[PDB]
Amino acid sequence: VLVQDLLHPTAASEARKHKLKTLVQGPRSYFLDVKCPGCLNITTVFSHAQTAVTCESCSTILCTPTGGKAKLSEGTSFRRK
């Protein structure tokens, strides 16, 4: 294409690209508030975690890790941030 507004692209294109190709690289991950049942102990958790995190109570494990994101256990109240 001869011309295009590279200084002001569309949200859909910059969401489509790799995160190292946008006009200013920024992460496509996120954080999340999560709570296992029982005690509240409202805990922050990372998307691509690499760990098996729990609450201070005991082994009440929240997010088992995987090569990309972390797979959360079934009974977990979680929420974007």
Binding site: T44, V45, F46
Partner: protein, 150 residues
């Protein structure tokens, strides 16, 4: 471009534009610092410490949460290791491949790979000995390294 192979992979991180983080975490610099020293006090490395802090506490990265980075913090609170972390892992992997060789003398692929590992060792050691985190007269030698890993 990724010296000891022919791959041109770019699997890296992308630290955001927000140099003052993160608008929801309102705890204190002293709290993350005591947490850092607690993890370093059970004997963890700065990489694993930042990993843990990130994926368990609200810590984007210590350099913006605190005013500085984790290795600086550990050097200042007295948990400054004898040598750098990455050099330590290269020496560990070196002695591992070495013992593999000594028990299995025909893994020529592993002899080659050991050569490349030790080349990398020597290069990072040269950088450290020029910028004074290590002293000159330091040198990788094999049995002393097998001892130094602890």
């Amino acid at each position: 471009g990724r010296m000891h192979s022919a791959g041109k992979g770019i699997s890296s991180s992308a630290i955001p534009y927000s140099r003052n983080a993160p608008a929801w975490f309102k705890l204190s610099s002293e709290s993350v610092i005591e947490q850092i020293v607690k993890y370093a006090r059970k004997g963890l490395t700065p990489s694993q410490i930042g990993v843990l802090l990130r994926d368990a506490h609200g810590v984007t990265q210590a350099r913006v949460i605190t005013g500085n980075k984790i290795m600086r913090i550990l050097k200042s609170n007295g948990l400054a290791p004898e040598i750098p972390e990455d050099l330590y892992y290269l020496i560990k992997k070196a002695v591992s491949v070495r013992k593999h060789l000594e028990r299995n003398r025909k893994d020529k692929d592993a002899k080659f790979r050991l050569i490349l590992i030790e080349s990398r060792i020597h290069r990072l050691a040269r950088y450290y000995r020029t910028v004074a985190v290590l002293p000159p007269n330091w040198k990788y030698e094999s049995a002393t390294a097998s001892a130094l890993v602890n």
